[PDB]
mmCIF file of C-alpha atoms and ligand atoms in Angstrom:
data_model
loop_
_atom_site.group_PDB
_atom_site.id
_atom_site.type_symbol
_atom_site.label_atom_id
_atom_site.label_comp_id
_atom_site.label_asym_id
_atom_site.label_seq_id
_atom_site.Cartn_x
_atom_site.Cartn_y
_atom_site.Cartn_z
ATOM 1 C CA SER R 1 114.061 120.867 98.255
ATOM 2 C CA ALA R 2 116.429 118.102 99.196
ATOM 3 C CA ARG R 3 113.511 116.529 100.813
ATOM 4 C CA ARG R 4 112.216 113.898 98.541
ATOM 5 C CA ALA R 5 108.562 113.988 97.754
ATOM 6 C CA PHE R 6 106.485 110.787 97.895
ATOM 7 C CA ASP R 7 103.489 109.366 96.102
ATOM 8 C CA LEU R 8 101.927 106.611 98.107
ATOM 9 C CA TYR R 9 99.329 104.361 96.561
ATOM 10 C CA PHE R 10 97.454 102.030 98.682
ATOM 11 C CA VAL R 11 96.098 98.865 96.707
ATOM 12 C CA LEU R 12 93.515 97.588 99.267
ATOM 13 C CA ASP R 13 91.987 94.005 99.137
ATOM 14 C CA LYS R 14 88.211 94.286 99.538
ATOM 15 C CA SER R 15 87.580 90.558 98.659
ATOM 16 C CA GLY R 16 85.313 88.149 100.381
ATOM 17 C CA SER R 17 88.418 86.278 101.882
ATOM 18 C CA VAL R 18 89.398 89.375 103.871
ATOM 19 C CA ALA R 19 85.812 90.525 104.904
ATOM 20 C CA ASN R 20 86.148 89.740 108.511
ATOM 21 C CA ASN R 21 89.593 91.541 108.761
ATOM 22 C CA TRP R 22 88.653 94.730 106.781
ATOM 23 C CA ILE R 23 89.204 96.794 109.779
ATOM 24 C CA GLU R 24 92.882 95.598 109.959
ATOM 25 C CA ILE R 25 93.263 96.995 106.431
ATOM 26 C CA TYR R 26 91.511 100.341 107.243
ATOM 27 C CA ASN R 27 93.289 100.654 110.373
ATOM 28 C CA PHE R 28 96.763 100.411 108.857
ATOM 29 C CA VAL R 29 95.873 103.053 106.127
ATOM 30 C CA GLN R 30 94.351 105.366 108.644
ATOM 31 C CA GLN R 31 97.452 105.220 110.916
ATOM 32 C CA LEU R 32 99.898 105.558 107.904
ATOM 33 C CA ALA R 33 97.985 108.670 106.613
ATOM 34 C CA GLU R 34 98.569 110.612 109.840
ATOM 35 C CA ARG R 35 101.669 109.139 111.500
ATOM 36 C CA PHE R 36 103.846 109.350 108.466
ATOM 37 C CA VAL R 37 102.093 112.076 106.195
ATOM 38 C CA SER R 38 104.716 115.056 105.968
ATOM 39 C CA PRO R 39 104.149 117.872 103.482
ATOM 40 C CA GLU R 40 104.895 117.358 99.856
ATOM 41 C CA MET R 41 103.437 113.707 100.001
ATOM 42 C CA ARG R 42 100.384 112.595 98.047
ATOM 43 C CA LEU R 43 98.481 109.637 98.586
ATOM 44 C CA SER R 44 95.963 107.512 96.569
ATOM 45 C CA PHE R 45 93.315 105.032 97.826
ATOM 46 C CA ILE R 46 92.611 102.176 95.540
ATOM 47 C CA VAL R 47 90.347 98.964 96.364
ATOM 48 C CA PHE R 48 89.851 95.785 94.367
ATOM 49 C CA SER R 49 87.784 92.782 94.261
ATOM 50 C CA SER R 50 86.308 91.766 91.099
ATOM 51 C CA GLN R 51 86.734 95.270 89.874
ATOM 52 C CA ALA R 52 89.269 97.939 90.946
ATOM 53 C CA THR R 53 88.265 101.299 92.010
ATOM 54 C CA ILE R 54 90.157 104.699 92.712
ATOM 55 C CA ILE R 55 88.425 105.935 95.900
ATOM 56 C CA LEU R 56 90.861 108.783 96.475
ATOM 57 C CA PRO R 57 92.867 110.050 93.302
ATOM 58 C CA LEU R 58 96.270 110.934 93.970
ATOM 59 C CA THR R 59 96.226 114.230 96.233
ATOM 60 C CA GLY R 60 98.048 115.780 99.067
ATOM 61 C CA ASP R 61 94.998 117.900 100.164
ATOM 62 C CA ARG R 62 94.350 117.037 103.867
ATOM 63 C CA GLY R 63 90.548 117.336 103.170
ATOM 64 C CA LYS R 64 90.242 114.863 100.450
ATOM 65 C CA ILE R 65 92.551 112.477 102.177
ATOM 66 C CA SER R 66 90.279 112.641 105.245
ATOM 67 C CA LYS R 67 87.212 112.079 103.061
ATOM 68 C CA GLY R 68 88.978 109.266 101.337
ATOM 69 C CA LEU R 69 89.534 107.590 104.739
ATOM 70 C CA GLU R 70 85.750 108.073 105.578
ATOM 71 C CA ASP R 71 84.843 106.321 102.148
ATOM 72 C CA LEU R 72 87.210 103.396 102.833
ATOM 73 C CA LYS R 73 85.252 102.961 106.121
ATOM 74 C CA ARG R 74 82.041 102.310 104.411
ATOM 75 C CA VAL R 75 83.507 99.693 102.227
ATOM 76 C CA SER R 76 81.883 96.455 102.105
ATOM 77 C CA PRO R 77 84.193 93.600 101.273
ATOM 78 C CA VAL R 78 82.905 91.085 98.751
ATOM 79 C CA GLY R 79 83.944 89.408 95.373
ATOM 80 C CA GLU R 80 86.782 87.888 93.771
ATOM 81 C CA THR R 81 90.640 89.067 94.070
ATOM 82 C CA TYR R 82 91.767 90.876 90.966
ATOM 83 C CA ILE R 83 94.809 92.478 92.376
ATOM 84 C CA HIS R 84 96.297 93.069 88.960
ATOM 85 C CA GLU R 85 93.544 95.543 88.294
ATOM 86 C CA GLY R 86 94.123 97.249 91.524
ATOM 87 C CA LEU R 87 97.827 97.491 90.662
ATOM 88 C CA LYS R 88 96.974 98.711 87.057
ATOM 89 C CA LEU R 89 95.092 101.738 88.435
ATOM 90 C CA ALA R 90 98.344 102.801 90.447
ATOM 91 C CA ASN R 91 100.254 102.317 87.380
ATOM 92 C CA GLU R 92 97.813 104.588 85.566
ATOM 93 C CA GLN R 93 97.918 107.179 87.924
ATOM 94 C CA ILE R 94 101.942 106.926 88.247
ATOM 95 C CA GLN R 95 102.418 107.314 84.450
ATOM 96 C CA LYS R 96 99.996 110.261 84.542
ATOM 97 C CA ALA R 97 101.867 112.056 87.447
ATOM 98 C CA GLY R 98 105.087 111.642 85.529
ATOM 99 C CA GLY R 99 106.151 108.125 85.651
ATOM 100 C CA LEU R 100 110.009 107.651 85.989
ATOM 101 C CA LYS R 101 110.026 111.394 86.874
ATOM 102 C CA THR R 102 108.076 110.614 90.121
ATOM 103 C CA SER R 103 108.948 108.875 93.394
ATOM 104 C CA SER R 104 106.091 106.552 93.701
ATOM 105 C CA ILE R 105 105.479 103.804 96.366
ATOM 106 C CA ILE R 106 102.702 101.252 96.058
ATOM 107 C CA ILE R 107 101.579 99.535 99.208
ATOM 108 C CA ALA R 108 99.388 96.552 98.674
ATOM 109 C CA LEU R 109 97.223 95.087 101.547
ATOM 110 C CA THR R 110 96.051 91.718 100.828
ATOM 111 C CA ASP R 111 96.237 87.948 101.790
ATOM 112 C CA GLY R 112 97.875 87.009 98.654
ATOM 113 C CA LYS R 113 95.456 84.309 98.103
ATOM 114 C CA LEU R 114 95.297 84.349 94.238
ATOM 115 C CA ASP R 115 93.558 82.216 91.721
ATOM 116 C CA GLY R 116 93.526 81.296 88.050
ATOM 117 C CA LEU R 117 95.353 83.880 85.908
ATOM 118 C CA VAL R 118 95.649 86.481 88.773
ATOM 119 C CA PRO R 119 99.037 85.302 89.837
ATOM 120 C CA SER R 120 100.717 85.834 86.385
ATOM 121 C CA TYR R 121 98.790 89.147 85.915
ATOM 122 C CA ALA R 122 99.578 90.409 89.274
ATOM 123 C CA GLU R 123 103.400 89.677 88.691
ATOM 124 C CA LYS R 124 103.382 91.102 85.280
ATOM 125 C CA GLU R 125 101.563 94.281 86.337
ATOM 126 C CA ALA R 126 104.041 94.704 89.303
ATOM 127 C CA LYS R 127 106.857 94.493 86.816
ATOM 128 C CA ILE R 128 105.157 97.499 84.952
ATOM 129 C CA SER R 129 105.129 99.276 88.378
ATOM 130 C CA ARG R 130 108.837 98.727 88.786
ATOM 131 C CA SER R 131 109.446 99.874 85.159
ATOM 132 C CA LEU R 132 107.652 103.102 86.077
ATOM 133 C CA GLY R 133 110.028 103.751 88.837
ATOM 134 C CA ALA R 134 107.818 102.561 91.680
ATOM 135 C CA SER R 135 108.633 100.623 94.633
ATOM 136 C CA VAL R 136 106.117 97.883 95.622
ATOM 137 C CA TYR R 137 105.489 96.893 99.059
ATOM 138 C CA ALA R 138 103.133 93.832 99.988
ATOM 139 C CA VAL R 139 101.544 94.090 103.603
ATOM 140 C CA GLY R 140 100.098 90.489 104.233
ATOM 141 C CA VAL R 141 96.571 90.010 105.766
ATOM 142 C CA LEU R 142 95.473 86.992 107.681
ATOM 143 C CA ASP R 143 97.210 83.715 106.850
ATOM 144 C CA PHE R 144 98.696 85.354 103.749
ATOM 145 C CA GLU R 145 100.679 83.595 101.076
ATOM 146 C CA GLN R 146 104.175 84.526 101.680
ATOM 147 C CA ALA R 147 105.422 83.324 98.272
ATOM 148 C CA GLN R 148 102.916 85.094 96.365
ATOM 149 C CA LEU R 149 103.637 88.438 98.160
ATOM 150 C CA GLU R 150 107.375 88.125 97.420
ATOM 151 C CA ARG R 151 106.796 87.672 93.833
ATOM 152 C CA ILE R 152 104.601 90.891 93.772
ATOM 153 C CA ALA R 153 106.810 93.077 95.985
ATOM 154 C CA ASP R 154 110.251 94.045 95.062
ATOM 155 C CA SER R 155 111.797 91.585 97.369
ATOM 156 C CA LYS R 156 111.299 89.711 100.480
ATOM 157 C CA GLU R 157 112.436 92.684 102.188
ATOM 158 C CA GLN R 158 109.457 94.423 101.017
ATOM 159 C CA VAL R 159 106.947 92.036 102.459
ATOM 160 C CA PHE R 160 105.578 92.650 106.034
ATOM 161 C CA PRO R 161 102.763 91.472 108.176
ATOM 162 C CA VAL R 162 99.947 94.048 109.114
ATOM 163 C CA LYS R 163 99.881 92.223 112.387
ATOM 164 C CA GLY R 164 103.329 93.953 113.216
ATOM 165 C CA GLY R 165 101.394 96.974 114.016
ATOM 166 C CA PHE R 166 103.148 100.214 114.693
ATOM 167 C CA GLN R 167 106.526 98.498 114.422
ATOM 168 C CA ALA R 168 105.608 96.972 110.896
ATOM 169 C CA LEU R 169 104.458 100.480 109.985
ATOM 170 C CA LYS R 170 107.780 101.935 111.317
ATOM 171 C CA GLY R 171 109.647 99.319 109.315
ATOM 172 C CA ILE R 172 107.861 100.453 106.298
ATOM 173 C CA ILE R 173 108.571 104.009 107.055
ATOM 174 C CA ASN R 174 112.181 103.465 107.515
ATOM 175 C CA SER R 175 112.290 101.364 104.510
ATOM 176 C CA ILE R 176 110.782 104.073 102.273
ATOM 177 C CA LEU R 177 113.493 106.469 103.450
HETATM 178 CL CL1 CL Y 1 88.018 86.230 97.652
HETATM 179 MG MG1 MG Y 2 91.307 87.677 98.706
#
């Protein structure tokens, strides 16, 4: 089919710094998983704090997606911000699904407040994402670090604030196309 199939990987920050704004991260994902969820699309739900976890493996089944959203709702944000581990679990599923032979999109929800080695590990891991043929988007939360999100996303054009709401979602939907 001329219609391009898309694999969407949500890499969600569940650290302590976003604990009071976790509803904003869930709302964005819940809105995106229904407003722009055409057939032949597949989604994955990944969260990260001090450890990364695949809450929803890559699937297009509407039932498992719905149950993945229910699991995101019960998430208790706490811990460090190891976004490279979250990106790494997306890269593992991308390579498994076919790597360069897939059309994979990574959407990271975070405040970009990284510490220690995570800035370099996150930038390196995102380059692995781009080497696998994936397009990386960064959706900033709270008073997010714009410069940090630009060094992770493909460009400043792929960095958007979550406060933009439906307009920001639409901008990301039009950007994916
Ligand atoms: Cl934190
Ligand atoms: Mg954080």
